[PDB]
Amino acid sequence: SDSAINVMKWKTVSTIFLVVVLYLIIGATVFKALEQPQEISQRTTIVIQREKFLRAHPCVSDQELDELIQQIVAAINAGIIPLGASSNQVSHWDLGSSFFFAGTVITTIGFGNISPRTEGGKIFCIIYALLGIPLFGFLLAGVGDQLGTIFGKGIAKVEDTFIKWVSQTKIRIISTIIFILFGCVLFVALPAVIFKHIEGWSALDAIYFVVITLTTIGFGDYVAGGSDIEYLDFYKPVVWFWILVGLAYFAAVLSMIGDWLRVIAKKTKEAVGEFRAHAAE
C-alpha cells in the first residue's frame, strides 16, 4: 500500500494549504487596518504639497513636473544624491559595499538597497547566488553546530546544579527557556541597543531590523551601515559576525516554533475530535 500513505499525505498538505490561505487573509486585513489610514493622510498631504508648487510656478509646463519626479525616482533606485549644495558623492559599489552586496545574496537577506543594473552584473548575480546560497548553507550549518556544542557545555553545568530531590523530560523545559532568554539577549536585545545608538534608530526599529534581517526577510527599509554617518569600522565587521551567528540562532528558533505548531496542531486536532464526540453530552 504505497498510495495509501500518499492519499493520507495529500490530505495533510491540503489542510495546511487552507490554513496558510486563511493565515494570509487574516494578516492581510490586519496590515490593511494598520497601514491604510496613515497611507491616505500622507498621500493627501503630499497632493497638498504638490499644488503649492504646481501653481506657485506656472512657467513650468506642469506636465513635465510629474515627468521630472519619475526621472528622480527612477534614478533614486541607483542611490543618487542629486543636489548642488552636496554634489560630491560616496560610491555604492566601492570596495566594501559590493562585499556587503555579495553578503545579501548568499544569505538571501537581500535588502535590495544596492542591486545590479548592468546585464553582466545580473548574469553574474544569478550564477553567484546559485553557487553561493548552497555554499553559505554549509558555513551556517557549522556555525549552528559550533554554537550548539557551546550551549551543550553550558547545560551540562546547569543541569547538574539544578538536580534537587528531578525528572528528565521536565528539565527539557528549563533548558529551552534559558536558550530563548540568553538568545534574545545576545542576538536581539544587545545588538538592537547598539543599533539604536550607532544608527540612531528607535528602539522599535532596531528590533524590527533585527527580526526582519535574521529571518532573511530583508525588506531593506532599514539597513545597518546604510547611511554615511561616521562608522567606526569596529562596527561593520562586528555586524558580519552578528549576522553569521544570528542567522544560525533564528534558524533554530524558527525551527522550535515549527515544532510547537506541530504539537498545537495535534492538540487542536484531537480537541475537535473531543468536541464532536460529545456534542453537548
Ligand X SMILES: CS(=O)(=O)Nc1ccc(C(=O)NCc2ccc(Cl)cc2Cl)cc1
Ligand Y SMILES: CCCCCCCCCCCCCCCC
Ligand Z SMILES: CCCCCCCCCCCCC/C=C/[C@@H](O)[C@H](CO)NC(=O)CCCCCCCCCCCCCCC
- Residue stretches of the annotated binding site for K(+): 108-111, 216-219
> Could you say whether residue 243 binds ligand Y (CB under 6 A)?
no
- Of 19, 60, 133, 211, the one binding ligand Z by CB under 6 A: 19
**Closest alpha carbon to 243 in 208, 203, 216, 261:** 216
Helices within 162-234 (DSSP H only): 168-184, 190-198, 203-214
CB closer to ligand Z, 53 vs 124 = 124
Distance of closest approach, residue 60 Cβ to ligand CCCCCCCCCCCC, in angstroms: 41
> Could you say whether residue 243 binds ligand X (CB under 6 A)?
yes
Q: For residue 274, what is its C-alpha cell?
A: 473531543
> Could you say whether residue 131 binds ligand CCCCCCCCCCCC (CB under 6 A)?
no
In order of 13, 23, 59, 254, the CA distances from 273 in angstroms are: 20, 22, 74, 29
Distance of closest approach, residue 48 Cβ to ligand Z, in angstroms: 35
Which helix (DSSP H) or strand (DSSP E) does residue 243 occupy?
Answer: helix 235-278
Q: Which of residues 146-175 bind ligand Y (CB under 6 A)?
A: none
> Could you say whether residue 124 binds ligand CCCCCCCCCCCC (CB under 6 A)?
yes
In order of 20, 76, 82, 89, 272, the CA distances from 85 in angstroms are: 51, 17, 9, 11, 68
* Residues binding ligand CCCCC (CB under 6 A): 186, 190-191, 238, 242
Cβ(137)–Cβ(165) under 8 Å? Answer: no
d(CA 145, CA 160): 23
Residues that bind ligand Y (CB under 6 A): 15-16, 19, 23, 26, 30, 96, 99, 120, 123-124, 126-127, 130, 184, 186, 188-191, 194, 204, 207, 233, 236-242, 245, 253, 261, 264-265, 268-269, 272
